Symmetry: D2
Subunit: 123 residues, 4 copies
């Protein structure tokens, strides 16, 4: 549901995610990371299943943040792939891939993988 | 390198995606796959880092495709994270995560991972 | 440290992991999964850093379980890659890859990725 | 297919691993890489599913290498998960996770992921 995803979310690292889910399946907002070579807010863009299922299945979504803004440029991009689960305590459980640009030679070590869980605070 | 991300790319599977790279880091376009519960074009939105470094590194980027369009809804979304490299043969090398919406009970098996290499050939 | 890893561990799904860390960096034991097309115990083999660092850095390790025993055969294998962190509450935090054998055609969907956290109960 | 996993394999990077596949699912051998804080041979231990299905599927397997030997200790371990396929050109297609031991503080960036294809060429 767009509404349910829309809001302010935080994860276990202390990062802030502000997103708006649009009617057409779009996600736009800004990400504030608590870690990494990242300072201030970064623009995020993603997509979600505007028409999930009835049942108590999560809503699949994903989004990308390139870590370049007017203050910094880490030359990397992270994509989070997960599911939104609503209820009294809504969560977005994700797995992410962080790719740094590298020379052909170090391309084998350009991507990190992890997982983040977000808890909603505001709409 | 710059601009050159813009165009039509194809992968091993036969998938095709057309993207437009905007001066400030946005990626917009459509994705048409060859495998899965997919049928036609899907909208894709991503970001790419517009000021890559000047050591011969690739340009980091990523995009998402929710697999829902006016014809099908596979209740899943794929995110590709990778880097673009130009030259006589430009390619985008990526790793992807495909998450399907599941009930709590099947959450452990909701995400597939793979890799795709796209070229303009 | 071999000792610290040796023991009985459980994760959030309810699976049992019984492992012995040998002096030479080896890990052997059995895995009892609570989910999947898996019944009874399965043999596991892995390796760990017998000489970690001083500091409060985790000990990197990894192990594999092919899901075939005398009772079942899911034709898949899972490898867990993570770190052991000791202390009063020792944990093994991992990320895993589950690959199912497939035809060339469905190879794109042969691997699942997730993460498990194990808590120690016994040696 | 069976037995055929046993042998010497090489990957794109130039890494080489020699493995022995035992009748009951064990994989044993040595791994020598071409990249990273690695120097010489490392011991590898894995498992492979000894009764693959009879639809033309690959044989699922996986192995681990802790990057410590008598010469170096990179305080990391790599696990490769994939499947073997035989034929005139047998190959092992894998995806790997490389975890480095870190302090809690850097736990978020402890694991790299990639893919390797090994052939006997
Ligand atoms: N809030 C989170 N931040 C880290 C993880 C996923 S992306 C990462 C921050 C990286 C910042 C930029 C960088 O270091 O390249 N979750
Ligand atoms: N070009 C690719 N197609 C498959 C992989 C990653 S995304 C995937 C197609 C999935 C279609 C929808 C589905 O089956 O859920 N790469
Ligand atoms: N204890 C765990 N079991 C599931 C995850 C990782 S492997 C998986 C069980 C799979 C069983 C065999 C199968 O279904 O193929 N953790
Ligand atoms: N053949 C491969 N070599 C690199 C990738 C995955 S494992 C890795 C070598 C790592 C060496 C030790 C290290 O740098 O930590 N594939």
């Amino acid at each position: 549901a767009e509404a349910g995803i829309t809001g302010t979310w935080y994860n276990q690292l202390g990062s802030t995610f502000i997103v708006t889910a649009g009617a057409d399946g779009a996600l736009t907002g800004t990400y504030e990371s608590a870690v990494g070579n990242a300072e201030s807010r970064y623009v995020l863009t993603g997509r979600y299943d505007s028409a999930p299922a009835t049942d108590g299945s999560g809503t699949a979504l994903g989004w990308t943040v390139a870590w370049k803004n007017n203050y910094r440029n880490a030359h990397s991009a992270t994509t989070w792939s997960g599911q939104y689960v609503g209820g009294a305590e809504a969560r977005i459980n994700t797995q992410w891939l962080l790719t740094s640009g590298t020379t052909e030679a170090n391309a084998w070590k350009s991507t990190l993988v992890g997982h983040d869980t977000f808890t909603k605070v505001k709409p």
